[PDB]
From Swiss-Prot, chain A:
Acts as a regulatory subunit of the 26S proteasome which is involved in the ATP-dependent degradation of ubiquitinated proteins. Interacts with UBR1. This is 26S proteasome regulatory subunit RPN2. Present with 4750 molecules/cell in log phase SD medium. Belongs to the proteasome subunit S1 family. N-acetylated by NAT1. The chain holds residues 4 to 158 of 945 of the full protein.
UniProtKB/Swiss-Prot annotation, chain B:
The chain holds residues 48 to 86 of 428 of the full protein. The lineage of its organism: Eukaryota, Fungi, Dikarya, Ascomycota, Saccharomycotina. N-acetylated by NAT3. It is found in: Cytoplasm; Nucleus. This is 26S proteasome regulatory subunit 6B homolog. Belongs to the AAA ATPase family. The 26S proteasome is involved in the ATP-dependent degradation of ubiquitinated proteins. The regulatory (or ATPase) complex confers ATP dependency and substrate specificity to the 26S complex. It comes from the Eukaryota.
Curated annotation (Swiss-Prot), chain D:
One of its GO terms (molecular function) is enzyme regulator activity. The chain holds residues 126 to 478 of 523 of the full protein. The keyword Phosphoprotein applies. The 26S proteasome is composed of a core protease, known as the 20S proteasome, capped at one or both ends by the 19S regulatory complex (RC). The RC is composed of at least 18 different subunits in two subcomplexes, the base and the lid, which form the portions proximal and distal to the 20S proteolytic core, respectively. It comes from Saccharomyces cerevisiae (strain ATCC 204508 / S288c). The gene is RPN3. This is 26S proteasome regulatory subunit RPN3. The keyword Cell membrane does not apply. N-acetylated by NAT1.
From Swiss-Prot, chain E:
PANTHER family: 26S PROTEASOME NON-ATPASE REGULATORY SUBUNIT 8. One of its GO terms (biological process) is ubiquitin-dependent protein catabolic process. One of its GO terms (cellular component) is proteasome complex. It comes from the Eukaryota. This is 26S proteasome regulatory subunit RPN12. Present with 9890 molecules/cell in log phase SD medium. Acts as a regulatory subunit of the 26S proteasome which is involved in the ATP-dependent degradation of ubiquitinated proteins. Necessary for activation of the CDC28 kinase. Belongs to the proteasome subunit S14 family. Residues 76-251 form the PCI domain. The gene is RPN12. Keywords: Proteasome.
Length: 155, 39, 35, 353, 272
């Protein structure tokens, strides 16, 4: 009902307890995220720790908070660095949102770099985490047997 | 998808039209003031 | 796929702003024509 | 499949009229049956012409009867149907794209706010307020007064009457319907007067006398003379006799907050106009309750913004001020920016007209 | 201090035998085994475990953990164990044996919350209780912070200070939140003494705020920036400034002349 007993273990030690804790928290984030939004500074602080190997769990939990906050840009950057929670095969309102969020973002970032160089798509100028999204999106369009959706995004 | 991209271009031309209507609105009052001074 | 449908529904809100500026000028420029 | 689902719902909404206050079927199987006819993709993908066809206005007064002395009867912690309802409710807003959603966004929050009003914590409801605020253009005039009713009540528990003031003004002016002008208006007018209880004014009965029945006029009239005259004995006897009316409206909390306002309001009623007020004159006034509390009573009332005074323990008096000045330089300019701010609410009429 | 093979028997026996500092050393091994089976919080589904197995014992495990940190004067850990005890005495309807059982630990959160000078969250927890007129109103333990805060809102700090002294509950559990809340009350009075007292001597400040030393009285005036003269204490701090950052709002300085002319130019563009 309340996330207070779940958020109390976030500031404690013994990260092995946080392994089963973040699994129980991630299920109720779609509900109690309004209360979790106050603990965001504590979630992002533990993400940069090298001895903390559960950072992939906090990447999806922190992304769902900004999902209903109105800013979808923050949820994309945290989910891509983990390279796990991002799956194009999973079809849901939340998963398809972060996959489609990188469409216009890839266009806006490429249009600014298009003036300096037209070969930017062959280099690392564009974020490889964002570059893989544009590559995996076409692979999903090719399986749908529709060439108007694939060529429309690449245009 | 071809019809959906055409509808996007239609409202882009109306974006400059909205700001241009306000240009004639302030410019007409300058010409309307000259018409009132003539009376 | 979403932003194709997202842009379609968001650009419909700008139609109301167009009718507000057209009706405001019609009540103005037509009065100057009579003067 | 939009037409096929809509055609089936047209026959479902006709049954929901019977399920609302009319024919309740069974108190067990029905609440489980109403859940399985909603979840299976009635809201779908938000294709076209999707609104007002869900439950929405109908289910507000339904589920509250099943939770109290019907399915539960205090035999469990919470209704399992309501637990799933809270899962479906918060999932509806999570999947919302914030595009055409106006009326459907504000109605679901009315449940999570009303639940915190009876059994629950209202501290977490402040986080939902940031998400709740949207320029909803589709809310009907009947629900515009209710949307402003809950926002004003949450701020009352938060000890802010200034923010809740702007919401309660537009609440009583809306909802012209007869049922909303009898049960909903009388309950809203008592909350509007509750804002005056925390402010310290408590105006007399003029418009509210004929607007509501004598049920709400009796407790407000006794609390008016008790807070104004500064009598805790009469204020205590009012809570005991009217306790039955105070519990259903969640106004029982006035035994603390409004009790503290009995002293604060009585300060402006009695005349402190003279400068040096002896300690014995303060003990005689306000019956014997002002004899035990003298220096501490005035100390907090000054910082709270009631009056401005100065206490002298050497000669045993208190120097008081009535806040009276003459406009010269910076005095009249304080309301200059306020009167301009008062007109800023009327500057939006250019875009409306 | 371990006692028996069971983790609960080692925590319960060592609690009544003293040494609260060494009793907390058995906390980490208990929570590791409970988090694997998710026994810390009640599950929404039905695992066929409610009043049996360790879930009935688990509510007593965290009950001792909350009472272990109250003797060590820790307000950071008490908020963590209290969050885990909120779902306890909440689920499983209202009926177990004694229902809420100890009423003093529930009142510890209401008394310690006032130490931060937050009056909004005080009345919010009172609404969280299921029975306002049954358990809250009748029992004096749950009604203790209500009657205490009542005198605080009425403005009387002398009667509210007597509840932390003449009361016999201040020995063991409430001793931790007594002096902490008393320090917040004296700090709240200091805000009133600035505006309500233009000049007051040194002997009265000791009596009003209940000080046991005159030299300690002047020490509190140094941290509050109170000018001190012979047999008198003035206040020059009535004027306020700073308060984070503000620009062109709330009585500006050099923009006063411009903003008056700016407000006249804003209405012209609205019409244009």
């Amino acid at each position: 009902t309340t996330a207070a007993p779940l958020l109390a273990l976030l500031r404690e030690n013994q990260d092995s307890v946080k392994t089963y804790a973040l699994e129980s928290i991630n299920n109720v984030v779609d509900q109690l995220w309004s209360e979790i939004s106050n603990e965001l500074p504590d979630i992002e602080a533990l993400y940069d720790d090298d001895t903390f190997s559960d950072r992939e769990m906090a990447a999806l939990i922190a992304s769902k908070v900004y999902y209903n906050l109105g800013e979808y840009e923050s949820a994309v950057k945290y989910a891509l660095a983990a390279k796990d929670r991002f799956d194009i095969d999973e079809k849901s309102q939340f998963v398809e949102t972060i996959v489609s969020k990188s469409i216009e973002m890839y266009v806006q970032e490429a249009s600014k770099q298009y003036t300096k160089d037209e070969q930017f798509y062959t280099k690392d100028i564009i974020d490889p985490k964002l570059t893989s999204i544009f590559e995996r999106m076409i692979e999903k369009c090719l399986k749908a047997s529709e060439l108007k959706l694939a060529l429309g995004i690449a245009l | 998808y071809f019809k959906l991209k055409k509808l996007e271009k239609e409202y882009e031309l109306l974006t400059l039209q909205e700001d241009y209507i306000k240009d004639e609105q302030r410019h007409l009052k300058r010409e309307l003031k000259r018409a009132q001074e003539e009376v | 796929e979403q932003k194709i449908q997202e842009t379609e529904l968001k650009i419909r809100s700008k139609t109301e702003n167009v009718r507000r500026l057209e009706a405001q000028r019609n009540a103005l420029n037509d009065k100057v024509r009579f003067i | 499949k939009t037409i096929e689902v809509t055609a089936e719902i047209n026959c479902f909404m006709h049954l929901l009229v019977q399920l609302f206050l009319w024919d309740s079927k069974e108190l067990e199987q029905l609440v489980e049956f109403n859940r399985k006819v909603v979840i299976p993709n009635l809201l779908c993908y938000y294709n076209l012409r999707s609104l007002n066809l869900i439950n929405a206005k109908l289910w507000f007064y339904i589920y509250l009867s099943h939770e109290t002395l019907a399915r539960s009867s205090e035999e469990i912690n919470s209704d399992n149907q309501n637990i799933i309802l809270r899962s479906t409710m918060m999932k509806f807003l999570k999947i919302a794209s914030l595009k055409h959603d106006n009326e459907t966004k504000a109605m679901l929050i009315n449940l999570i706010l009303r639940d915190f009003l009876n059994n629950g914590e209202v501290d977490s409801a402040s986080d939902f307020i940031s998400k709740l605020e949207y320029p909803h253009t589709d809310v009907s005039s009947s629900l515009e007064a209710r949307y402003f009713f809950y926002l004003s009540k949450i701020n009352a528990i938060q000890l802010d009457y200034s923010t809740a003031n702007e919401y309660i003004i537009a609440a009583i002016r809306k909802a012209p319907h007869n049922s909303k002008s009898l049960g909903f208006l009388q309950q809203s007018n008592k909350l509007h007067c509750c804002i005056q209880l925390l402010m310290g004014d408590i105006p007399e009965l003029s418009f509210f006398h004929q607007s509501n029945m004598q049920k709400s006029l009796l407790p407000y009239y006794h609390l008016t003379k008790a807070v104004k005259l500064g009598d805790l004995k009469k204020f205590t006897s009012t809570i005991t006799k009217y306790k039955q009316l105070l519990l259903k409206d969640d106004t029982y909390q006035l035994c603390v907050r409004l009790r503290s306002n009995v002293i604060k309001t009585g300060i402006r009623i009695i005349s402190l106009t003279y400068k040096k007020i002896s300690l014995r004159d303060i003990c005689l006034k306000l019956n014997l309750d002002s004899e035990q509390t003298v220096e501490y009573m005035v100390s907090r009332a000054i910082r709270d913004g009631v009056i401005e005074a100065k206490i002298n323990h050497e000669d045993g008096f208190i120097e008081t001020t009535e806040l009276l000045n003459i406009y010269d330089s910076e005095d009249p300019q304080q309301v200059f920016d306020e009167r301009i701010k008062f007109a800023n609410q009327l500057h939006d009429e250019y875009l409306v007209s | 201090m371990p006692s028996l093979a069971e983790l609960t028997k080692s925590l319960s026996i060592a609690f009544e035998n003293g040494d609260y500092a060494a009793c907390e050393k058995l906390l980490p091994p208990i929570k590791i085994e409970l988090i694997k089976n998710n026994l810390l919080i009640p599950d929404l589904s039905i695992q066929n475990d409610i009043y049996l197995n360790d879930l009935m014992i688990t509510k007593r495990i965290l009950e001792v953990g909350a009472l272990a940190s109250i003797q060590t004067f820790n307000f950071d850990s008490f908020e963590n164990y209290f969050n885990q005890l909120k779902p306890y005495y909440f689920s499983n309807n209202h009926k177990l044996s004694e229902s809420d059982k100890k009423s003093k630990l529930i009142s510890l959160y209401l008394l310690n919350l006032l130490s931060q000078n937050n009056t909004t969250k005080f009345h919010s927890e009172l609404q969280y209780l299921d029975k306002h007129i049954k358990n809250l109103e009748d029992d004096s333990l749950l009604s203790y912070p209500i009657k205490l805060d009542r005198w605080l809102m009425e403005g009387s700090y002398q009667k509210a200070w007597d509840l932390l002294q003449s009361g016999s509950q201040n020995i063991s559990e409430f001793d931790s939140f007594t002096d902490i809340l008393k320090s917040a009350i004296r700090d709240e009075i200091a805000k009133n003494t600035e505006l309500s007292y233009d000049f007051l001597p040194l002997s009265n400040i000791k009596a009003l705020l209940f000080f046991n030393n005159e030299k300690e009285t002047e020490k509190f005036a140094l941290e509050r920036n109170w000018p001190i003269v012979n047999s008198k204490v003035y206040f020059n701090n009535q004027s306020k400034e700073k308060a984070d950052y503000e620009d062109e709002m709330m009585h500006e300085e050099d923009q006063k002349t411009n903003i008056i002319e700016k407000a006249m130019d804003y209405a012209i563009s609205i019409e244009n």
